[PDB]
Amino acid sequence: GYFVSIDAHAEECFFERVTSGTKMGLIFEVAEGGFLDIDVEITGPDNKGIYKGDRESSGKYTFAAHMDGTYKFCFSNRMSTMTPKIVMFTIDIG
Amino acid sequence: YFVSIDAHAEECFFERVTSGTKMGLIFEVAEGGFLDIDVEITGPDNKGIYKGDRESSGKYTFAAHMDGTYKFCFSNRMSTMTPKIVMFTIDIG
């Protein structure tokens, strides 16, 4: 399955280029381990805050591109964790 | 787009493209310091494709050497009392 490892006080981002009107879906779940939640942010090509979620253990967020361009999906670890947070996720386009 | 870059800060923008796609950058420093900025464009393999030091403006086109996300970064390495303001456009072919 798809996942990302996020070190303490770090952000890991993923990118998709899509056309206006395209459905985009994020699903995520923090993996098994010592940590329960993650910060998530989705931003559009002109820095629109599409989604911002703090301290979420899991989530589903579906939206439609409002313009052509690159969309940014970011996971942030805001704590001084001794090991990185692991988060399972998928980004579905169309 | 206008972006403010504080003293000793960096601001990056990202475009995901396919190999061979043309990518245009136009930029001009509008305000701050000596009206100069450092520019770095880096590919998804961490291969830098453009580095400009202390540039006041530029217009360039690049061809992506591989699929993935390219990072366009503006860095202000002066201890300016004001931030640099850069006006820029990234065009993707």
UniProtKB/Swiss-Prot annotation, chain A:
Q: Which residues lie on this side of the membrane: Lumenal?
A: 2-94
Q: How does it assemble?
A: Monomer and homodimer in the endoplasmic reticulum, endoplasmic reticulum-Golgi intermediate compartment and Golgi. Probably oligomerizes with other members of the EMP24/GP25L family such as TMED7, TMED9 and TMED10. Interacts (via GOLD domain) with TMED10 (via GOLD domain). Associates with the COPI vesicle coat (coatomer); TMED10:TMED2 heterotetramers are proposed to be involved in coatomer association. Interacts (via C-terminus) with COPG1; the interaction involves dimeric TMED2. Interacts with SEC23A; indicative for an association of TMED2 with the COPII vesicle coat.
This protein's species is Homo sapiens
- Family classification: Belongs to the EMP24/GP25L family.
Domain (GOLD) spans 11-93
Please tell me what else the database record remarks about this protein.
Ectopic expression of TMED2 alone does not result in its proper cis-Golgi network localization. Coexpression of TMED10 is necessary, and coexpression of TMED3 and/or TMED9 is facilitating localization. Down-regulation of TMED10 expression reduces TMED2 protein level.
Write out the function statement from the record.
Involved in vesicular protein trafficking. Mainly functions in the early secretory pathway but also in post-Golgi membranes. Thought to act as cargo receptor at the lumenal side for incorporation of secretory cargo molecules into transport vesicles and to be involved in vesicle coat formation at the cytoplasmic side.
Q: What is the protein named?
A: Transmembrane emp24 domain-containing protein 2
Kindly list the places in or outside the cell where this protein is found, as annotated in its UniProt entry. Cytoplasmic vesicle membrane; Cytoplasmic vesicle, COPI-coated vesicle membrane; Golgi apparatus, cis-Golgi network membrane; Golgi apparatus, Golgi stack membrane
- Phylogenetic lineage: Eukaryota, Metazoa, Chordata, Craniata, Vertebrata
